[PDB]
């Protein structure tokens, strides 16, 4: 794939992750971007996380279809920068 | 392995992942189900984690055997929606 | 590499995560060998962590030495059992 | 790549990451140094995490400068003691 087709979906995967936490979990939309990041990457800290049913099936969605599409991203923008 | 056989060994997974959370720690159904995503993606928040031996055995033995299988599943998963 | 020398690279990562984990930071046996399993798998719940600046030091060399350790063992168990 | 470059790409990441935290969050020098490999690496215990708006952000830009850089440095490590 194009890099800047992977780039065009990794940014769906972040409007989609940050727009859902915000709505469903209460969240500003500043945590909730901070929050999506650090899930998609896989760091977790979990000093944010989902606390309702509909959160935690929402965060799944999320985990199986940003986790990936972020580890292509990564790799792809390595290849650009070094 | 074709895509629909990764398919089948990760749902296993995440049965046994599942209801052994829900059993051996005492979790909801739901919890355990969000427990064992987060789990086998590496996310680990630890919103929830095992408190007792017997879940924290149980726990290496999910780790070992489906944060594989998931990275698999989410690998093929990428080629059938990109 | 041989998928069993690669078995025993890996169990000298956890005797050396877990008996680490335990005189350092002063935790059990089997929470060490558990702790120790959750931060080379990354998945890193945060339940147990080091608090002291020579945990810390010995944490990061752990992370360096089997994180990559343990993807691969995770990679060549896959080939046996599938 | 070169292994001895991307042994400078991580450590210039290293040292990007650690005085971001310290300056940012105003944990210590150690800390910094600690949370930044628990970073890259994906493991987020979450026992040190950015509380400010201006951390979270610092922190997105290493989480996607970091995590590849991190991951192709620790394969190529393993080729050099393996
Ligand atoms: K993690
Ligand atoms: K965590
Ligand atoms: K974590
Ligand atoms: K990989
Ligand atoms: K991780």
């Known amino acids: ?18 727009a859902g936490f915000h709505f469903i979990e209460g969240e500003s939309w500043t945590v909730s971007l901070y929050w999506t990041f650090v899930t998609i990457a ?9 606390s309702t ?9 999320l985990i199986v279809l940003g986790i990936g599409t972020f580890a292509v991203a990564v790799e792809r923008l390595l290849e650009f920068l070094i």
Do not use: E, N, Q
């Open 53 to 61: 049913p509909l959160g935690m099936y929402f965060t799944v969605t």
């Open 42 to 50: 896989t760091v977790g800290y979990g000093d944010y996380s989902p």
């Open 1 to 18: 794939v194009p890099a800047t087709r992977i780039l065009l979906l990794v940014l769906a995967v972040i409007i989609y992750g940050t």
